[PDB]
Design a protein around this motif. Structure first.
Motif, PDB file in Angstrom:
ATOM      1  N   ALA B   5       0.392  -1.282   0.185  1.00  0.00           N
ATOM      2  CA  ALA B   5       0.099  -0.271   0.095  1.00  0.00           C
ATOM      3  C   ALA B   5       0.919   0.903   0.139  1.00  0.00           C
ATOM      4  O   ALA B   5       1.902   1.709   0.762  1.00  0.00           O
ATOM      5  CB  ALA B   5      -0.938   0.058   1.212  1.00  0.00           C
ATOM      6  N   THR B   7       1.584   5.276   0.570  1.00  0.00           N
ATOM      7  CA  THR B   7       0.376   6.647   0.691  1.00  0.00           C
ATOM      8  C   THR B   7       1.788   7.541   0.113  1.00  0.00           C
ATOM      9  O   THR B   7       3.184   8.204   0.081  1.00  0.00           O
ATOM     10  CB  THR B   7       0.659   7.046   1.977  1.00  0.00           C
ATOM     11  OG1 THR B   7      -0.510   6.415   2.159  1.00  0.00           O
ATOM     12  CG2 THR B   7      -0.050   8.419   2.182  1.00  0.00           C
ATOM     13  N   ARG B  93       3.531  -1.302   3.818  1.00  0.00           N
ATOM     14  CA  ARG B  93       2.828   0.354   3.398  1.00  0.00           C
ATOM     15  C   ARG B  93       4.165   0.726   2.932  1.00  0.00           C
ATOM     16  O   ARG B  93       5.571   0.789   3.837  1.00  0.00           O
ATOM     17  CB  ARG B  93       2.039   0.771   4.713  1.00  0.00           C
ATOM     18  CG  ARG B  93       1.232   0.150   4.823  1.00  0.00           C
ATOM     19  CD  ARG B  93       0.904   0.548   5.799  1.00  0.00           C
ATOM     20  NE  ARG B  93      -0.781   0.724   6.734  1.00  0.00           N
ATOM     21  CZ  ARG B  93      -1.511   1.015   5.619  1.00  0.00           C
ATOM     22  NH1 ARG B  93      -1.771   1.469   4.820  1.00  0.00           N
ATOM     23  NH2 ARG B  93      -2.952   0.395   6.034  1.00  0.00           N
ATOM     24  N   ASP B 124      -2.527   3.478  -2.720  1.00  0.00           N
ATOM     25  CA  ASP B 124      -3.684   3.772  -1.928  1.00  0.00           C
ATOM     26  C   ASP B 124      -4.260   4.964  -1.725  1.00  0.00           C
ATOM     27  O   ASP B 124      -5.545   5.012  -2.297  1.00  0.00           O
ATOM     28  CB  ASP B 124      -3.005   3.870  -0.434  1.00  0.00           C
ATOM     29  CG  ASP B 124      -3.913   4.590   0.502  1.00  0.00           C
ATOM     30  OD1 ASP B 124      -5.543   3.842   0.220  1.00  0.00           O
ATOM     31  OD2 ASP B 124      -3.319   4.506   1.474  1.00  0.00           O
ATOM     32  N   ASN B 197      -5.290   3.716   4.743  1.00  0.00           N
ATOM     33  CA  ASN B 197      -6.600   3.637   3.765  1.00  0.00           C
ATOM     34  C   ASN B 197      -7.490   4.086   3.185  1.00  0.00           C
ATOM     35  O   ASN B 197      -8.159   4.497   3.794  1.00  0.00           O
ATOM     36  CB  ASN B 197      -7.331   2.616   5.162  1.00  0.00           C
ATOM     37  CG  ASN B 197      -5.957   1.246   5.360  1.00  0.00           C
ATOM     38  OD1 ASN B 197      -5.031   0.420   4.726  1.00  0.00           O
ATOM     39  ND2 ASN B 197      -7.059   1.272   7.114  1.00  0.00           N
ATOM     40  N   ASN B 199      -7.960   4.320   0.007  1.00  0.00           N
ATOM     41  CA  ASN B 199      -8.998   3.450  -1.519  1.00  0.00           C
ATOM     42  C   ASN B 199      -8.879   4.493  -2.400  1.00  0.00           C
ATOM     43  O   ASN B 199     -10.005   4.298  -3.112  1.00  0.00           O
ATOM     44  CB  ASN B 199     -10.448   3.154  -0.762  1.00  0.00           C
ATOM     45  CG  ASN B 199     -10.213   1.846  -0.073  1.00  0.00           C
ATOM     46  OD1 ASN B 199      -9.911   0.732  -0.150  1.00  0.00           O
ATOM     47  ND2 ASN B 199     -10.667   2.344   0.937  1.00  0.00           N
TER      48      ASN B 199
END
Ligand code: ZN
Ligand code: ZN
Ligand code: ZN
Ligand code: ZN
Ligand code: ZN
Lengths: 317, 318
Positions: B5, B7, B93, B124, B197, B199
């Motif tokens: 994920a 970011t 992450r 993400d 998170n 999405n």
């Protein structure tokens, strides 16, 4: 033989359309592939779609018109594929990055993979500037100043109608002290002016326009050049640490930078050049009878000039 | 194989960025995070290795990883995968700093450039940090300040305790970005959970969180704005496809991000789409059923021809 890549930038002007219309239609004798945003070709010979969905159009004048997705690598690699298969033929590549386009990411593409480094060779960045609207555009959009900052050559047009624009000459110089400013007052832009800029070669004369004393006016812009002059030699290890710290501190801020360095104990000039995070250095012509000195130029936005000058000042013994 | 994920942390630099980075690299939070940053916040470096592409990878005491980047971000991303596959490092992450003057655009495009990155990494969202005290000034002076907000899937508004009545700021952020929800970070440190998170890069049916209201005069304050398009009529899939393709090419350099839900004439399923600059994709989704069909689209960008865009969609009517 490496393909010569030229980036054509600058804000939305009418002169860009005329220049592109000349490359795609007329017979100038150049074998050029063009990546543009619009549609200026009035004579499409053939057309082929690359393995990465790149739309490649062959024109009647021999030139090529090419499209691009969000990944420029796709168009570049598809051009090479169909060049190797004799489907297309071209010597120069001209990429339009006008309007809001950032020249930065495009330049970096030609250094991303080994294949692109070998098959393509960047020539220079050409910035088109409209003398009538330049000041307004640069005041409102940071990217307008940036496109000038990345330039190896600045073509200033429509000065015949803009009137007394000497103030504009100065502002371009404060932003970019590397690039010479070509002012076309009568006639149009010659196609050949886009080529052979030698912008991505190591230079010893890094500063074309010498800085003048204008304290109250040399702090207007957001993008500026910092010219650093040293009349003293520096330790190659010491200056290497200073640069690495400098280039990391202003990583997101630095557009382009070049310099000639006087290395303590070495009889040869040390030249360097860089674009954002990518930078390289190499030795060059020996000093000889010429008095040794260092000359560097850093182009970027919100650069910590005080810290930069202080760092180089501490390299003195 | 669970896709890592990713970011993106953007926004103009301040105390909120350094403190947040210093908390990820040092303190124990329970996350397995690899960080690509500009500075040097970590203190307890456990181990250090060099990748095949000269990537400096540092393993930290709290389990996290600190990583450097050259001008080619692909190198660090591929080297992280190499040492992950070889059990040298462990993380699920990735946090990439794109603060200050950094453009989130090229970074986003990196995660779509090659197939390996498409399968091993999963974007993400883009998190924009906003200083309530200096936001208006920064956005007036720098286009990139508005752009970072425009790319955001989530906007963290900090220093509201020192700023006070930052209501005029809420609206300006909404006009710039009508997609991203705004989170007023209470006084102190930004909690680590506010970065994760979102999405943000998945096809959504509820593309607009902050439904636009009427503020004519103040809605011409920014250079980056959102255009919310509502349609209470179905459109031919071919006709709307031509309109988008012309729209995307006309405003290629201008569009930051765009998402939409479409009512397709003759099709009982929702058509969703999303895009970042020149990169765009569409796919069918949940059927309509008893829910009344309609179209909702949002276009975020600079100097967008709103008039032409609305007129183009208006011409899709019978
Ligand atoms: Zn064309
Ligand atoms: Zn670090
Ligand atoms: Zn690549
Ligand atoms: Zn509010
Ligand atoms: Zn409280």
């Amino acid at each position: 033989n490496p393909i010569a890549v030229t980036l054509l930038t600058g804000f939305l002007g009418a002169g860009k359309t005329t220049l592109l219309r000349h490359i795609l239609n007329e017979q100038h004798g150049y074998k050029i592939a063009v990546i543009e945003n619009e549609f200026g070709e009035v004579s499409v010979d053939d057309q082929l779609i690359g393995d990465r969905a790149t739309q490649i159009k062959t024109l009647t004048n021999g030139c090529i018109c090419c499209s691009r997705s969000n990944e420029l690598e796709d168009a570049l690699l598809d051009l090479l594929d169909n060049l190797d298969k004799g489907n297309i033929q071209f010597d120069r590549l001209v990429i339009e990055c006008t309007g809001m386009a950032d020249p930065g990411p495009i330049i970096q593409t030609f250094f991303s993979h080994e294949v692109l480094c070998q098959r393509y060779l960047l020539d220079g960045v050409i910035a088109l500037v409209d003398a009538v609207h330049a000041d307004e555009q640069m005041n409102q959009f940071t990217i307008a100043q940036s496109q000038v900052g990345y330039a190896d050559r600045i073509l200033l047009t429509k000065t015949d109608v803009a009137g007394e624009a000497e103030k504009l000459h100065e502002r371009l110089a404060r932003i970019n002290a590397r690039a010479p400013v070509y002012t076309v007052t009568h006639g149009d832009i010659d196609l050949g002016l886009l080529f052979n800029t030698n912008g991505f070669m190591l230079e010893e004369n890094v500063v074309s326009t010498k800085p003048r004393f204008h304290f109250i006016a040399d702090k207007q812009n957001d993008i500026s050049s910092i010219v650093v002059e040293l009349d003293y030699p520096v330790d190659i290890s010491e200056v290497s640490r200073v640069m690495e710290n400098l280039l990391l501190e202003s990583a997101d801020k630095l557009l382009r930078y070049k310099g000639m360095l006087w290395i303590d104990g070495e009889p040869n000039r040390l030249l360097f050049q860089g674009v954002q995070r990518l930078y390289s250095a190499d030795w060059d012509r020996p000093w000889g009878d010429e008095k040794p000195h260092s000359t560097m130029v850093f182009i970027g936005i919100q650069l910590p000039e005080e810290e930069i000058r202080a760092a180089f000042a501490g390299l003195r013994k």
